[PDB]
Design a protein around this ligand. Structure first.
Ligand SMILES: *P([O])(=O)(O[C][C]1O[C](N2[C]=C([C])C(=O)[N]C2=O)[C][C]1[O])OP([O])(=O)OP([O])([O])=O
Ligand SMILES: [Mg+2]
Ligand SMILES: [Mg+2]
Length: 342
DNA sequence: TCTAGGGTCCTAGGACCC
DNA sequence: TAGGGTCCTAGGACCC
């Protein structure tokens, strides 16, 4: 009953698009991200910038101290969305079992596939080659019997490469696999796991499921299963977006409600436009607001509400501003909508 | 260095129902 | 008849 799962992942996706579209950026350190003045972070960087330590999620002021010649780009999301549509059409030439996880990556289930003599290895190579031939961007891939191993595999021969894990190879692969490599095990969980002596899947194999369930709940079960190589999650091609949000961080903290209302007045048209692309009548389940203060604490209040409404969002922002706030600067204002269930 | 914006999923207490 | 299920809501880890 061994499945064949491919995970395909574009290399340096936004930066790779900006280099294709402007080859002057091919050989200098570049990153997509907000300026230091706009208090931004790096969305991604190309390999010349990564050499300096530039990474996604790094504050832009840190990126520039590492890499003073970093060229900073604002990002062209329609160009990225166009590349995404194109690689997803390429995936559809091989299977309809496609679960996109973001613009630039997807799981493919090729168990029942007829192409390339049923070789998942060869299908993944053909997909990478087609992507390069038709988009002039490179992709990496991972092939494994389950989702999470395929996703780990696609990182191991990046860029422009792939890696295959057979069922025979899974135990040796797991034995020394750090837990932080498992998708869903982040910094906070890895630090709690490390503090109790659990660093690798090998360690977690030496653990009692009951203990893990008590200490971590349902996450304890996922940890126990992943460390065994167990991941029965099916490739699901039917997922749908559940929310849409629009938020902005100010270049300077705001301290007056008039400044906050001004911001919302700019955010609301953007939220209406994006909602209307997917729900023309603007009918929704909930709407709400988000404030983030200068001490980085963040609050949201949302409520049942039938149709996107600018004044109610203003009124709700005003309550949050008056109430849970307390004289701090505000760095971010956001609007949010929960979509009607399908 | 000084910390984004797009999202998904889980948890947990109280309201509400039976 | 003392408790079980199910929304509502806020927060936060985590993902790209
Ligand atoms: P990935 O595959 O992790 O992200 C794809 C693109 O999403 C954007 N993005 C990513 C991260 C991790 C983030 O924190 N913020 C983002 O905005 C930019 C990404 O390009 O990232 P990648 O393709 O760039 O890097 P590699 O080559 O390692 O896959
Ligand atoms: Mg990528
Ligand atoms: Mg990706």
């Amino acid at each position: 009953g061994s499945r064949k799962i491919i995970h395909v992942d574009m290399d340096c996706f936004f930066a790779a698009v900006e280099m294709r579209d402007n080859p002057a950026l091919r050989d200098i350190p570049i990153a997509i991200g907000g300026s230091r003045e706009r208090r931004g972070v790096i969305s991604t960087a190309n390999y010349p910038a990564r050499k300096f330590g530039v990474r996604s999620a790094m504050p832009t002021g840190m990126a520039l101290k590492l890499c003073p010649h970093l060229t900073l780009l604002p990002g062209r999301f329609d160009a990225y969305k166009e590349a995404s549509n194109h690689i997803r059409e390429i995936f559809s030439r091989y299977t309809s079992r496609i679960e996109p996880l973001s613009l630039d990556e997807a799981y493919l289930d090729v168990t029942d596939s007829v192409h390339c003599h049923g070789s998942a290895t060869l299908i993944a190579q053909e997909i990478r080659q087609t992507i390069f031939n038709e988009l002039q961007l490179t992709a990496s891939a991972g092939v494994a019997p389950v989702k999470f191993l395929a996703k780990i595999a696609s990182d191991m021969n990046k860029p422009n490469g792939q890696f295959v894990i057979t069922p025979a190879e899974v135990p040796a692969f797991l034995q020394t696999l750090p837990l932080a490599k498992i998708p869903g095990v982040g910094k906070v969980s890895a630090a709690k796991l490390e503090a109790m002596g659990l660093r690798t899947c090998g360690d977690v194999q030496k653990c009692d499921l009951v203990m893990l369930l008590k200490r971590f709940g349902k996450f304890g079960r996922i940890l126990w299963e992943r460390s065994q190589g167990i991941d029965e999650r099916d490739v699901n091609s039917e997922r749908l977006r559940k929310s849409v949000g629009v938020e902005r961080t100010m270049a300077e903290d705001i301290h007056h409600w008039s400044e906050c209302e001004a911001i919302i007045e700019r955010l609301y048209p953007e939220l209406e436009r994006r909602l209307a692309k997917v729900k023309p009548d603007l009918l929704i389940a909930r709407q709400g607001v988000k404030l983030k203060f200068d001490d980085f604490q963040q609050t949201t209040q949302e409520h049942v509400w039938p149709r996107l409404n600018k004044a109610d969002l203003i009124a709700t922002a005003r309550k949050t501003w008056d109430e849970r706030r307390g004289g701090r600067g505000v760095r971010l204002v956001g609007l949010h909508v929960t979509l009607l269930d399908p």
